[PDB]
């Protein structure tokens, strides 16, 4: 759905003579907190030898975009499940929010790579500070000074079955 970003902090259950277990924090993109905690436990089991029944969730907090109304360039480092193994992939998305960039990336992976949410792993979303570090042409073509482009062949939506004039596609 419309993605949100959470931080999930968890730990192992405290045992005898081993108090204050180490706290581990992850940034998860998910539609709701149930999915966020599920993804957190999945990745924690995949990385460390901690299970859901053996650990606990200490905190889960939604992180909002710092400047949601500023146009930004994001470099997205991801990897996807394959038979040969994990394969890295780097994408560049121009958007105003990390969650919007993540949603765009998931739609792109579904459209092109035929990939799914549980197969795509989000490793890093990083804002590109300087425009000289952008290295994809489909993003760089929108960084040109005084960029103007038209929208030829405008198609207007009709609310009636029949029209009494030949339509025009001017704009």
């Amino acid at each position: 759905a419309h993605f949100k970003e959470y931080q999930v902090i968890g730990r192992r259950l405290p045992t005898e003579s081993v108090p204050e277990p180490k706290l581990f924090r992850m940034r998860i993109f998910a539609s709701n907190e149930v999915i966020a905690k599920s993804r957190y436990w999945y990745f924690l089991q995949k990385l460390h030898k901690v299970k859901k029944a053996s650990g606990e969730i200490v905190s889960i907090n939604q992180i909002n975009e710092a400047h949601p109304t500023k146009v930004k360039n994001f470099g997205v480092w991801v990897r996807y499940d394959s038979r040969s193994g994990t394969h890295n992939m780097y994408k560049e998305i121009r958007d105003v929010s990390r969650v919007a960039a993540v949603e765009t990336l998931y739609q792109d992976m579904a459209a092109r790579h035929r990939a799914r949410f549980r197969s795509i792993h989000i490793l890093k979303v990083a804002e590109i500070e300087k425009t000289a570090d952008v290295k994809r042409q489909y993003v760089k073509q929108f960084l040109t000074k005084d960029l103007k482009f038209p929208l030829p062949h405008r198609v207007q939506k009709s609310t009636k079955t029949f029209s009494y004039k030949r339509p025009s596609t001017f704009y």
Partner: protein, 72 residues
């Protein structure tokens, strides 16, 4: 300009059910072969990522800290 006969695309029930049975047999044979075979069983940072130097410096700092974390 003589057009030939076109192959039909209407689904046959008997063919579909036979394909289902053939697929189940194939899956069982694949599972058996995967259990029976004797065959021996981390790409890292992509080169197009901008902050590769930052990632490498962070992992070097983590290694340097964790080398002494367990020692003392």
């Amino acid at each position: 300009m003589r057009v030939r006969k076109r192959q039909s695309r209407r689904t046959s029930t008997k063919l579909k059910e036979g394909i289902k049975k053939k697929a189940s047999a194939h899956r069982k044979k694949e599972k058996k072969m995967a259990k029976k075979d004797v065959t021996w069983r981390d790409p890292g940072i992509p080169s197009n990522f901008p902050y590769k130097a930052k990632i490498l410096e962070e992992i070097e700092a983590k290694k340097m800290k964790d080398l002494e974390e367990r020692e003392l």
